[PDB]
Design a protein around this ligand. Structure first.
Ligand SMILES: NC(=O)c1ccc[n+]([C@@H]2O[C@H](COP(=O)([O-])OP(=O)(O)OC[C@H]3O[C@@H](n4cnc5c(N)ncnc54)[C@H](O)[C@@H]3O)[C@@H](O)[C@H]2O)c1
Ligand SMILES: NC(=O)c1ccc[n+]([C@@H]2O[C@H](COP(=O)([O-])OP(=O)(O)OC[C@H]3O[C@@H](n4cnc5c(N)ncnc54)[C@H](O)[C@@H]3O)[C@@H](O)[C@H]2O)c1
Ligand SMILES: O=C(O)[C@@H]1CCCCN1
Ligand SMILES: O=C(O)[C@@H]1CCCCN1
Ligand code: NA
Ligand code: NA
Lengths: 344, 344
């Protein structure tokens, strides 16, 4: 037995061969079906993730997220949020890896990059929610925060909605000015616009910012379109929120993971009895979303491990089909199972 | 930047080049100083580990164990307990791996086998506790359970006590018959002995069994020597214990990690009020352990992530000096930190 390692090159080759659009569509479709299975009680929500706060160079967190498929495998994503990474080190804010363990033996069976996978499934989740809750003729996307997640927010939403333009804002002028180049492949025209203009004109908004704890909101409490749908994607430290309380109190709010969102999502601001049905329920039974496209709605997205396990399965199917990756004997399996020093 | 991977062949090379006695002594030395640092408030106990119980083929658990050295690195050990592994698959019961992440950026910097490392630091921890709590002239070690952990229990204790004899028992006859061969490198004469004889004759005992939940104790509450010290090393599922309650209630009890021991150790059987200072406090001030050398004492060992971080440092130091391991680009670091699709 050896661990199947998909390095950065192998992940790059899967995306290159399949294409960004088709790979995102596969993950959207797998996520939709998997969420529906949770909604029907055929699968379980993942347990609450855990994490470690880091104060330097700016406040961040490092988190672990398990998900078990009983009798088959266990997935663990480890992921850091380090929002000084881009300016200070040229590294992405979100840095992680995803591992798979055999449920019968405990053995580490596969290990892959989590940077691209995280961005893909985070965009995909917003696309699943926005298909349910945004107007199907939505034309104008608003983006607050134009870093890494904003790229796959725009990409995923452009595959499920007839987006013609994106109005975008970032507190860093360099980051908002560079977004049009990073977005060009989608064909969606990009225009920089202040948050009040985005609130007024967008049919759908994604907020995906590295705003600090207690420094929200990133979208002002002002006039929005009657049918606005917001993907609240930003999430890291307890106490970090992006939306104004007044808007949230007026909205139909669905969380990807209610217990997690009450701790780390926009639902931190809400009484727990104010939550709409969770996304998995909407996927299994759309009665709860019926009519909500035409009124204010918020998808409170925190991310949970089942989404990473599903996206990893999409990558592993593609990689297995193409015999990609390497095999590394990492775990020591002594020829005598009862002798740790039998370095066989 | 690439991940440094120490596979099975590299860990084997470290043992071959350093030697077993020297490697174990280095880990004992690091663990003793690191525990003293916790006992003096210069370092802190790892957070409570997390875990997922599994029921097939027999009840087992899979756990994740993080530890943070602020400003330096985060360590995470993922480890399975699957006690049917030896008989069904020729695999060790304990299967795991240890990862190191840069604390500043979150990047995965190192990954290695956890199977041998776990056995080494678990032996080392018993050696640290027994040096503090067993009579310095202890001649007879008892071992209940003669699987993987028992090998390093004997090895480590033989390096800190004047052991002349090991009395050993296992419910599987093939496992107790093979222990002497696995233990030969220690030079300590091994005798098979039933648990009642071990209880009556041993100066120090380690219990390290795969006993099922509710099927203890593995050592009878009979005559024990007045000065007996026990390392209660077995730990996995909630409800699993190895010692008789009446013996435990008469003992001075110290846990490696009090909150973990209350959940998964022999301290499950006791009130939280009933515990002594933890092992770290005894390392920092041995005057609290000296008096208890001549009375009944129990070290309640669950394992915690700091021990894995310290043992990993020993292996990385030795591996770097010998230029061992490989470099694998696992994490995706896009050419543009704000563009998840900018594959290198
Ligand atoms: N919900 C999920 O599943 C999920 C998954 C991944 C990341 N995230 C979260 O999304 C957020 C963004 O991640 P990223 O990878 O895009 O980070 P990033 O650093 O690439 O982008 C964040 C951007 O937000 C900008 N910003 C900071 N404060 C702002 C404000 N007040 N208004 C507008 N812009 C602001 C920054 O200048 C930066 O350009 C983080 O909180 C992250 O933890 C969530
Ligand atoms: N405290 C720690 O840090 C730490 C570290 C590693 C393992 N452990 C725990 O130690 C225990 C042993 O692990 P291992 O790797 O040696 O497993 P192993 O399967 O190699 O050995 C366990 C042995 O116990 C024997 N056994 C089962 N029931 C028994 C009984 N009633 N009396 C006597 N022997 C019995 C089995 O036949 C087997 O030989 C497990 O509970 C494991 O989770 C603890
Ligand atoms: O699910 C995730 O991967 C993100 C990482 C950053 C913190 C919020 N959750
Ligand atoms: O600390 C450890 O490595 C062990 C693994 C098995 C369960 C008990 N703790
Ligand atoms: Na959120
Ligand atoms: Na124990």
């Amino acid at each position: 037995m050896e661990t199947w390692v998909l390095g950065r090159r192998d992940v790059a080759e899967v995306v290159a061969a399949v294409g960004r659009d088709e790979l995102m569509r596969r993950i959207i479709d797998r996520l939709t079906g998997g969420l529906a299975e949770i909604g029907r009680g055929e699968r379980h929500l993942s347990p609450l993730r855990g994490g470690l706060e880091r104060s330097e160079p700016v406040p961040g967190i490092w988190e672990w997220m398990p998900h078990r498929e009983p009798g088959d495998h266990i997935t663990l994503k480890t992921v850091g949020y380090s929002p000084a990474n881009p300016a200070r080190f040229g590294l992405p804010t979100i840095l992680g890896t995803v591992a798979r363990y055999d449920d019968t033996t405990g053995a580490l069976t596969a290990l892959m990059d989590g940077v691209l996978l995280t961005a893909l499934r985070t965009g995909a989740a917003s696309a699943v929610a926005s298909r349910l809750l945004a107007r199907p003729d939505s034309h104008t996307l608003g983006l607050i925060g134009t870093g890494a997640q904003a790229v796959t927010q725009l990409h995923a939403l452009s595959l499920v909605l007839p987006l013609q333009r994106a109005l975008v804002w970032d507190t860093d002028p360099a980051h908002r000015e560079s977004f049009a180049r990073r977005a060009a492949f989608t064909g969606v025209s990009v225009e920089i616009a202040e948050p009040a203009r985005i609130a007024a004109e967008a049919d759908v908004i994604s907020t995906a910012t590295s705003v600090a704890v207690g420094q929200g909101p990133v979208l002002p409490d002002t006039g929005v379109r009657e049918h606005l749908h917001i993907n609240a994607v930003g999430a890291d430290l307890v106490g970090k929120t992006e939306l104004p309380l007044g808007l949230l109190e007026r909205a139909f709010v669905t969380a990807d993971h209610p217990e997690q969102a009450l701790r780390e999502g926009e639902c931190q601001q809400l009484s727990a009895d104010r939550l709409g049905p969770q996304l998995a329920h909407l996927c299994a039974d759309p009665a709860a979303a019926a009519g909500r496209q035409d009124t204010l709605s918020v998808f409170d997205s925190t991310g949970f491990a089942f989404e990473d396990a599903l996206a990893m399965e999409v990558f592993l199917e593609a990689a297995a089909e193409r015999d990609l990756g390497i095999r590394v004997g990492i775990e020591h399996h002594p020829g005598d199972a009862l002798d740790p020093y039998a370095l066989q």
